[PDB]
Every structure is written in C-alpha cells, then in structure tokens.
C-alpha cells in the first residue's frame with residue numbers, strides 16, 4: 087500500500103556519502119580477519135579522552151538539582167541561559183564588541199547549520215571550500231539552494247566551489263571567484279587543518295563587503311590554533327557587518343555526545359532592506375528549537391571557568407603532542423604533510439595516487455585506518471586526512487608501523 | 496549593509512503575539528498591583544521536580560564521562576539503541592513498531608521542523624482549528640503556505656479543520672478538502688480532547704482514501720485516563736499513513752532537558768513506492784547529531800518500571816490539581832471541556848471575546864489565563880487553563896474564582 091505524497095525534490099538531488107560507512111565496514115572486516123593484530127585508527131575525528139571531572143561534576147550536580155524545588159526548571163530561553171551566553175562572549179570574543187544577546191546557544195554546529203539554512207531559504211547561492219565539509223553542502227541541497235550533482239566534475243550545479251590547496255596556501259583566489267549570496271568558510275579547516283591568516287581573513291571580509299555576501303564562518307576548531315593566527319573572524323574590523331560565526335564545544339571540550347555549541351549573529355548584520363538578520367534568527371530559533379539541554383548548558387559554563395579552561399587546555403596539549411609525533415614521522419618519510427599545527431587534522435598529499443588506494447595500502451600493510459581525501463570532494467583527491475585524537479601508545483605504535491612500511495615500501 | 500534578500504517565507508510569517516502579550520500584561524499588572532499575588536494558569540510548563548531516581552541516572556552517566564570506561568563521544572544520530580528499544584516496548588507494545596523505526600530527538604519542536612524539512616515546500620497541509628503554533632509556523636517557514644489572510648485569520652493554501660463541541664472536536668470529513676499532510680494532535684493542545692478509537696479509524700481511512708500522510712502528535716498521551724487510544728498505531732493500517740511524534744517534555748518534566756522521538760514506519764511510502772524512512776534517516780544525518788547523551792540516559796531511566804511508577808506519581812499530583820479546578824469551574828456553571836485526558840481545560844464563554852474574559856479575570860482575580868483567540872478563530876470565545884502548577888496556587892486561584900463567579 088502506497089501514498090500519493092510526492093518525494094521532496096531536494097532529496098532526489100542529494101547524493102549519499104559513502105565515505106564513513108565504508109571506512110567503518112572496512113575497519114570491522116579487517117579487525118575480524120586479523121584478530122592477530124591490534125587495528126589502530128587515525129581516521130574519525132571524535133575526541134577520545136574523558137572530560138575533566140571538574141566540568142562533569144557541575145553537570146552531575148545540576149542534574150541532581152532538578153529533583154529539588156530550588157533547582158528544578160522547565161523550559162529555558164531558546165536562545166540559551168544568560169550566564170552561558172555572557173561567558174561565551176567574554177571567553178571567545180573579549181574586546182570584539184560581541185554582546186551576550188548576539189550569542190545563540192545550540193545543541194552543536196550540525197543543527198545550527200541546518201537552522202541557518204532554514205533562515206536563509208532556498209533562494210540564495212552559496213560558495214564552499216573544496217575540499218568540502220559535508221554539512222554545509224548537504225544542508226544547502228536539502229533546503230533547495232542547488233541543482234543536481236554533476237557526476238563528471240563531482241560538483242553540485244549552482245554552487246561555487248573554491249579550491250583551497252598548497253598551490254594557493256589553502257585560500258581561494260578571490261579575484262577569480264564568482265560572487266554568491268553566502269560564503270561558507272571553515273578555519274581551522276576540516277579536512278586540511280589550515281587556519282587562515284589575518285591578511286587572508288581581511289581579504290575575505292572585503293570580498294564579502296564588495297559582493298554584498300554574508301560569511302558563515304565555522305570556528306569549531308579555533309581552540310587548536312597555536313600560531314597566533316586569528317580565532318574569530320570578528321578580529322577583523324567590519325566583520326560584524328558581513329559574518330555569522332558558528333562554533334562548538336564538541337572538539338574544544340569533547341562534548342560530541344553531550345551536544346552544545348553556539349552561533350553569533352551580530353546586531354549590525356543587515357539584509358538588502360536594512361532589517362537586522364538577528365531579529366529573524368530569533369524567530370527561526372523560537373520556531374524550530376526549544377533550547378539546548380539544561381544539563382549540557384551547565385557543563386558548557388563549567389568549561390569556561392578558569393579552572394575548566396585550564397583542565398581542557400591540558401587534554402588538548404596531549405592531543406597536540408600526538409600530532410607532533412605523527413607529523414614528525416610522516417615528514418621524516420618524505421611526505422608532504424599539511425595542517426597539523428593549528429588543528430587536530432593532518433592533510434597528507436600522495437601526488438599521483440588515488441586516496442582510496444593509499445588507504446588500502448596503509449590498511450593492509452600496517453593495520454591503520456585513515457580517511458580518504460576523495461571523500462571530501464575532488465580537491466581532496468590524492469590526499470589523506472589523519473587524526474591526532476587517540477591514546478599516546480596508539481600514536482607511538484602507529485608511528486613505528488608507518489616507519490617500517492614506508493621504508494620498504 | 497549586505498545584498499542578501501530576506502527569505503520570503505520570513506515575510507509571510509506573522510508574529511504570534513499571544514504569549515509575549517500575556518507576558519507583557521502579566522508584568523504590567525504585577526507592576527500596578529504589586530500588593531497582590533498574581534497567579535498564573537496560563538503557561539503549560541511542568542513545575543514539579545523530576546524524580547531523584549531518574550535524575551540520579553543522569554548524574555551518574557555525566558560523572559561517567561570523566562572516566563575512560565564511561566566516556567562517550569558521538570552516538571547514533573537516530574539515538575541509543577537501548578533507548579529506542581525501550582520506547583518501542585514501553586509505548587508501542589504489540590503495535591509492530593520496530594526499534595529501528597524510532598528516531599530519538601531533542602524534543603518535538605525540533606522534530607517537527609525536521610519533518611517539515613523532509614516534506615519540503617511543495618506540499619499542502621491540514622491543521623486543526625484551534626491550532627497549535629508549531630505546526631503552522633514551521634509550515635510557513637519552510638514555504639508550504641501563502642500569506643496570512645487577515646479577515647479569515649488563516650494562512651492561504653492551508654486547510655483549517657474546525658474542532659469544537661459541535662463536532663466533538665473532530666473534523667467533519669465531508670467539509671475537509673484533501674491535503675498531502677494532515678496534522679493531528681491528540682490529546683489536543685489547546686482543547687484537551689483525545690480522539691476516540693472510532694474517530695481515529697475514520698481519520699486513517701480518510702488519509703488512505705486521499706493518499707495523505709498524518710503527522711500525529713501524542714505528546715500528551717500519558718495524561719489519557721479514559722481507555723482512549725494513546726498511539727495512532729492502535730489503528731490497523733495506521734502504519735501505512737502515519738508518522739507519530741512525541742516527547743518526554745510533559746510526560747516527565749523534561750521540558751528543559753530536551754528529549755522526544757518520532758516514529759516513521761517501514762511501510763510508509765511515497766507516490767513512487769520509496770520508503771519515507773530512508774529519507775528521514777538522511778534528513779536526521781544531515782541536520783542533527785543526536786539528542787544529548789545525558790538526556791538519553793535520563794529517558795531510559797524514565798522507562799524503567801521504577802521510573803514509570805515515580806513519573807505516574809508526579810502526574811497524579813497534576814491530575815489532582817485539574818480535579819480541583821474542574822470541580823470548581825463546573826460547580827459554578829461554566830462549560831468546561833478537556834481536563835480529563837490532558838493537562839488543559841478549555842472553557843467556553845459563549846458570546847464573549849477571549850481577550851475580554853482574560854481582562855475580566857485578570858482585573859478582578861489577578862489570575863492569568865490563555866485567550867483561545869490566540870490559537871485561531873476556532874478558539875474565539877474560549878480560554879485555556881493549565882493544571883500544572885503548585886497545589887496551593889491551584890487552591891487559591893480556585894478560591895478567587897469562586898468569589899468572583901458567585
């Protein structure tokens with residue numbers, strides 16, 4: 087028995103991404119076939135160390151407080167607790183003129199991105215970096231901003247793809263980039279790990295101003311920056327007139343399963359007609375969201391105490407040391423290794439090889455999982471993404487195995 | 496300035512003034528009459544604490560995130576398997592709902608907007624009148640409507656299905672034009688009416704005959720005290736036409752914790768025979784990364800036989816409050832609907848505007864209610880009144896209404 091409801095066209099357009107389902111199938115199979123040998127993963131980018139007890143303890147207490155009259159509350163502001171918003175403003179945007187009432191607390195970036203796309207609607211054009219983070223492009227297709235997927239080029243019609251690679255220091259050539267209503271920009275980037283420089287961000291803000299575009303700037307990896315490169319786009323004067331920033335506690339503090347992030351919508355960000363965009367994001371939030379979990383919001387606040395930040399910084403130094411082990415290994419083997427410094431991802435170029443064949447080689451001969459760059463679009467072909475999340479003894483063993491393998495080869 | 500054109504669907508969306516306005520009137524009244532205790536029977540938020548049994552599991556799970564053995568990052572976007580199985584067994588026992596047809600959400604508001612993303616702009620919808628804002632607002636935002644026709648107080652291109660005492664709060668199918676989608680909330684907000692087995696049978700058949708789907712909102716099912724049905728999948732064949740949406744919010748006081756679910760049956764097919772479940776999976780993967788792992792732990796603890804017993808007991812407190820209010824209002828000669836199977840009373844003042852009754856009750860008793868007008872034209876002449884709240888507020892408000900309506 088069938089219905090007469092017509093499948094949303096935007097679903098017919100949307101191509102499935104087989105990347106992670108494949109990685110996972112291949113990981114299982116390989117673990118099953120070689121129970122002999124500990125498989126190690128440098129692939130998925132989930133955080134792995136526990137959240138500090140200081141932070142968690144505030145989440146356990148708040149939860150217990152919900153069983154008391156003095157601590158019980160129902161619905162909170164859909165925008166998020168005021169204490170948490172003031173803390174995000176002060177912690178991440180000190181002196182950048184971000185008001186606590188421009189912060190919108192989310193259950194993380196994935197949802198936030200889809201809510202921004204609902205705000206924007208079907209009748210806008212977008213630009214994304216290539217290699218491309220799935221969320222921006224998938225959400226764009228689903229809401230109706232694109233045509234079909236052009237199989238030969240591996241690009242959706244009506245979408246500007248901006249190549250970012252070693253040849254252009256991972257920043258598009260803005261003089262040859264067509265104009266769009268919206269530009270998505272992720273820095274530090276997933277998958278390349280590149281953090282744009284102050285000069286590059288200046289140019290992006292000016293390009294946006296000149297084109298009347300808005301920037302959706304994804305800073306979910308900012309806490310990994312070690313250069314002194316900028317962490318928020320609002321470090322650039324005038325960014326507030328063109329840019330929305332999206333971020334997360336996911337990778338910063340391991341809240342991947344706890345679910346907490348935010349977006350910034352400046353006061354000064356205006357449509358064609360002079361109406362502040364912030365007023366309408368409020369209405370999108372009220373209509374499609376009832377707030378981040380109260381217990382997650384208490385955890386978030388505890389992340390931003392001086393004690394929370396100190397403990398989190400310490401977990402992130404562990405991850406930083408792991409990346410160095412891996413970058414030093416791969417560079418010592420003559421590989422062209424990008425990223426690694428300011429992000430938890432290394433982006434390794436195997437000029438002349440398909441990402442998948444290198445994945446296969448490395449999996450079969452070292453029992454290590456990586457991520458095929460191909461999976462992120464055509465600008466990822468020939469690269470692998472490699473993660474510094476994981477335990478130290480696994481990074482060290484993986485380093486040993488790669489040494490052995492590539493000195494063969 | 497920027498060159499971005501405002502989404503047209505935002506220009507279509509009228510602000511609903513209802514709650515912001517009740518709120519403004521409350522604050523204004525407390526400010527002019529600070530010498531009196533204002534009492535609210537307006538907002539439908541739960542107010543009793545969540546049982547310590549449930550909460551304790553959420554605290555333990557949270558402490559477990561600071562351990563190697565208990566640290567958990569990303570879960571399945573669809574939700575923990577243990578939680579889905581428990582929702583299936585607890586709420587759909589014997590109704591052929593599989594654990595893999597359950598999609599765990601951060602509650603109905605989000606879930607509704609994700610269903611509307613799935614469905615898209617090119618569908619027509621039917622909603623009950625009086626109307627729950629979420630369904631209609633989400634429909635406008637995604638592009639399913641024309642502008643708001645001020646005279647009729649209806650969005651163009653939307654079928655409004657009057658439900659009132661004259662048709663036992665069930666739409667007259669002979670006067671209901673066909674749509675792609677029918678939204679049906681039972682127990683209803685705002686009227687509190689729970690459709691009967693026979694009504695639901697008719698609705699499922701109507702849907703089959705029209706090739707429509709039903710989005711059935713059972714968030715208030717746990718308040719049903721009749722033996723009326725709690726899920727639409729009690730009706731044979733519902734599984735070929737209906738999606739069900741629900742929540743821990745009012746059931747267990749998780750309004751601020753954020754947890755719900757939807758059911759998308761295997762058997763629910765588009766025009767072309769494709770299972771809708773395959774595409775909701777892709778919507779969920781794309782627009783969501785899961786409900787909070789802590790909230791999902793709380794949810795699972797709600798559905799233990801110990802959790803359910805404790806939740807039932809908080810809901811009896813509310814049930815006793817409703818009885819105080821109903822017995823008072825009815826003992827005074829008011830026409831009271833709802834109340835029995837939902838936490839909301841729907842009180843008719845034939846001949847009066849909702850807002851003028853609101854004004855009267857606010858000025859003379861310092862009590863806040865919800866003007867039925869706010870929910871659309873089928874709410875005109877009614878007030879919605881809530882049984883959530885502390886007992887002593889219910890009692891005092893009951894005393895004041897006794898004095899006033901005498």
Ligand SMILES: Cc1ncc(COP(=O)(O)O)c(C=O)c1O
Nearest residue numbers: 194195196276306334336347784
């Ligand atoms: C590019 C990027 N942005 C944002 C996020 C944060 O996602 P969420 O907050 O939904 O975990 C991630 C996590 O993988 C990511 O890779």
Ligand SMILES: Cc1ncc(COP(=O)(O)O)c(C=O)c1O
Nearest residue numbers: 376602603604684714742744755
């Ligand atoms: C009709 C209706 N459905 C569903 C919900 C649950 O919403 P949430 O789960 O987002 O709190 C409510 C709560 O207001 C409601 O009134």
